């Protein structure tokens, strides 16, 4: 675990990423992973289980449930972290299979796949911040849904578990993932500056 | 964790692999492993315990949701992704056991080998598409099924347990399968090309 | 995790050991392990939770699930997994423990010995076949069984958690576990033939 | 787990950091995270579960569980011991930069940076001890406690889970903390009487 | 993982310990550790939350699985392996302490206390094989038992969770255990003639 | 997992260490780690959900647990281990720093240093011996208790879970303790004579 290792690791072995790339979006990403570890299984964990409604109609909970939380937050991260890190991953990979094939016997490509991986990055950041507006708009979840869905009969009130400290790890993810889009604009305009 | 020790690790220290095979196929491979990870426990974990049916019937709960799923898709992603990996563990295992009996002391035979593994590939991958459509045609879940299995009376209704949740990851999984088909294809038809 | 390293781990370091016996006999052992990985705790978690029957007796339900699966197949896999893997460590470890005491300072010794493992663990898998086949006659498992054993007056039926899922892994392992013995009896064969 | 690595693991391969700041801020650490490790999940694994009201009325368990527990204490300190770290994770990030450009092809910016990050630190330090009294006066838990937010009618009592050792886990968190902010002070002041 | 240094590891580095000791011994306490592993949490894991009696009388189920297990098999055979490799790991710790001694700067101490660790192996295996009997008389376990403990009035009848599971397990276990005593025993003859 | 390089771990590099504390406080050290981990999540898992208390009153469950157990036995001894193996590891550092400096560019200090840690390793064992007795009187639990703490009507009877288990383990923890301090306290007595 050697800092040198770590380092050359979150790098990716790049040789065009800037100071901002090979530090700050790398220790904002370790971030954003130790926070949904640490509030994945414990915060979330009872999402479902604990959500309860007022009534008696079988399979008004699941169904009120799946109305008002269509995709959890949890996995809705999961999911950005995952496709924020593919382009990360495929330059990772491209360069080691040049260093491969070199061996076994190309900056400016390097440089504009680099380019193209960081926009795709922060398209990413885009889509993912925009989708999880949709979904949830705000920031602050509420104790009480009002829940009207079939087979519930008219409207039902549904409690939800830790809205409080769901709401705190909403605004702490949400804060790292705008940091994330004003360095990777940051990282952008740097590069294009540097090139002329 | 070296990016080379991990590429080599991935690529199985093949020469007949292209870029494709050796940088697409890995990423999108390591992409559905990491879904899957996330997804298996969390979105499908409470699948059975959750299944409610509206009745007083002991024992129509598990004969529905048996009916309804005859397999769990993380099962049944989790036996693709082994199948599909199974031809490449065997390249990977015939290029070390070469290595040892020559080091203890043949392209044309790793080439073939290796055009055979991605036929393989290619075709477990359509294998499991079609019987994922045979058993759950379409691609989205309901959130409310009709039962009448024995000895359910008559029809009864059960509710399913984040149908919209399970909803978005069968599209990402579907689309990442149907990707590593696309890039298979291409895969063989570059080999046989190049092979002229 | 590099593939000469796993190669020579799975290999044993042996210098007797053919190209099935070494490839093919190591990735159907590894394809074993994944599946019972999988389907471990997942298919067969809630084996005994989730089995019920339709009665009021106090017990019935522990008692009929004992009378139904003495031993659950995932234990059963698991028995035999390391009962068929013991040879193979025993060879492994005796193979170093000459290394060991030729450092510290044969082969018809290790020829034997080889011979001799491979016809226990041939042994091992047919007996465990035969166990499977005893205890749980066909290969499919039913939704509804008849119980009759005490406490439970008369006749009750009891249900039983996934039966297809369940049938699904079993025909994998079986199917498995069928080859490996069609590969033992080749590698004996070949053996046989060789010595001559 | 050489006990040089890990003393240069802990340390940031940082040559500005005194005797303190290297052996006893890094053992209270570990202390904090062991401490933590260990009475997450078996103290505050059913603090929401075994969280119970005196009431007949449908969600009241939730809301009044929300309202005196906004964020729980294993996840309040598991952010403090991330905010913390984080200026010790950009210094070594920063370190390894260095070297690699340097390998590629300064001590004052070291310097200054290491005491921003040790300032930081103790800011960090100070703003979770005054958020922990704000949400939470005073030190002990109590076993009753008094909810009357909707929809609980008039005031109901509930009933924490284990106050008591929560309470003593709160005092050994606590003063650790307090010991951290302490030892920061003291390398602060340290280092600049040093600079003198 | 290396073959020659898992048998370095296993052997603990002695230069008295015979082929039994180092191949066999080694093989049947691997098989052990491999066997309560996949036995503990799965088939013990419910052995008191599923054990009911068939009574109204509150504390009567916790007070009867106290009665009749005053210490699970699992916890049994876990503190047997402890203990019985305790003084491999004495004699392992002492081995290395005089390498670092001389480094710093015998063999019939050597040899003699390895003689004592195999006459305390073998005592601690008998001791815990006896304790075994005294506990649990016989080898199988009953569905139905007898409770008569305070509070349960009169005798109420208790039903316990996989007898014949756990059956199969206890005559693994044991069988493996008397195969230890007998290499010991083995060990310790051979040991004294080669002396001689 | 080299035997020299888990002793140079457990010894901490330290030069002034004796026989007894390099191997015999060691292996108790593990001793005490071993059990712990086997008994903790195994034994003392369902402590508080298994308890029951024979009433209607809501709430007398949570309070009565909490008023015989202010602090589970399980999370004392790991607090025990944890501030026993504190100077432990300060000297582990300090020796760590040392080389580092050294490096860059006391044998009595170290000395006293050691001296220091192990009267300190001695105070802390003989606090928490205190602490338990204090805590627990006796070594024994008892299946019934009674308790009358508000909100619990009078006096009501409390059932505890595996009395009998946990006090097999209180035993063994305990006298594992014991064996701790006589050899810390024979530790300073040999460094004292030696030092004359
Ligand atoms: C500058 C930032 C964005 C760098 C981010 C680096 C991320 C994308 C890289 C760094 C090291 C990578 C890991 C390296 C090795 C493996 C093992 C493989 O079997 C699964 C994926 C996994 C676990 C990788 C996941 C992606 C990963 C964590
Ligand atoms: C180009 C793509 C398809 C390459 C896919 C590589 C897959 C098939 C290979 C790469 C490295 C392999 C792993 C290498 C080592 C082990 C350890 C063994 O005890 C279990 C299997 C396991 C975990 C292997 C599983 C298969 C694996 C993940
Ligand atoms: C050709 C086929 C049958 C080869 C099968 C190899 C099996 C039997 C061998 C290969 C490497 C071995 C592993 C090597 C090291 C350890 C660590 C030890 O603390 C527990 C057992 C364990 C985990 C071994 C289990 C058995 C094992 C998996
Ligand atoms: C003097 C004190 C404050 C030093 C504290 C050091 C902390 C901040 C450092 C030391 C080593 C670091 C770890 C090194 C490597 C990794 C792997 C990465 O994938 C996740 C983060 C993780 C696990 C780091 C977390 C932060 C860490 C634990
Ligand atoms: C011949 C037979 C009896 C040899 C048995 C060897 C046993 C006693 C030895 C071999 C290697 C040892 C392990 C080596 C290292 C560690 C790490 C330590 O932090 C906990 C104990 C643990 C996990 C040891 C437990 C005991 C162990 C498994
Ligand atoms: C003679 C006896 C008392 C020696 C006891 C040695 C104990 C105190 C030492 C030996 C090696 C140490 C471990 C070495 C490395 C790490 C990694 C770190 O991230 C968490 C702490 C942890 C896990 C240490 C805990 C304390 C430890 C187990």
């Known amino acids: 675990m050697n800092w040198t290792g770590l380092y050359t690791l979150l790098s990716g072995v790049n040789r065009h990423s800037t100071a901002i790339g090979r530090v700050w979006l790398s220790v904002i990403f370790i971030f954003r992973i130790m926070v949904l570890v640490v509030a994945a299984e ?8 604990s959500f309860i409604c ?3 109609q079988p399979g008004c909970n699941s169904v009120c449930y799946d ?15 995952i496709l924020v890190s ?6 990772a990979m491209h360069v080691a299979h040049q260093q491969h094939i070199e061996k076994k016997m190309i900056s400016g490509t390097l440089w504009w796949t680099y380019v193209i991986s960081v926009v795709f990055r ?7 911040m925009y989708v999880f507006y949709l979904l949830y708009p705000g920031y602050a979840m509420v ?11 008219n409207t039902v009130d549904c409690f939800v578990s830790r809205p409080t400290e769901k709401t705190v790890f909403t605004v702490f ?11 990777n604009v940051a990282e952008v305009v740097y590069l294009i500056i540097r090139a002329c």
Chains 1, 2, 3, 4, 5, 6 share one sequence.
């Open 42 to 49: 414990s915060v979330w964990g009872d999402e479902k289980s």
């Open 173 to 183: 993810m949400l804060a790292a993932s705008g940091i994330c889009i004003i360095l």
């Open 143 to 153: 104790r009480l849904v009002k829940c009207d869905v079939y087979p519930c009969p």
């Open 54 to 56: 007022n009534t008696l």
């Open 67 to 81: 109305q008002f939380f269509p995709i959890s937050h949890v996995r809705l991260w999961s999911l950005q972290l």
């Open 122 to 128: 922060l398209l990413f950041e885009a889509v993912f």
């Open 86 to 91: 593919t382009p990360a991953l495929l330059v």
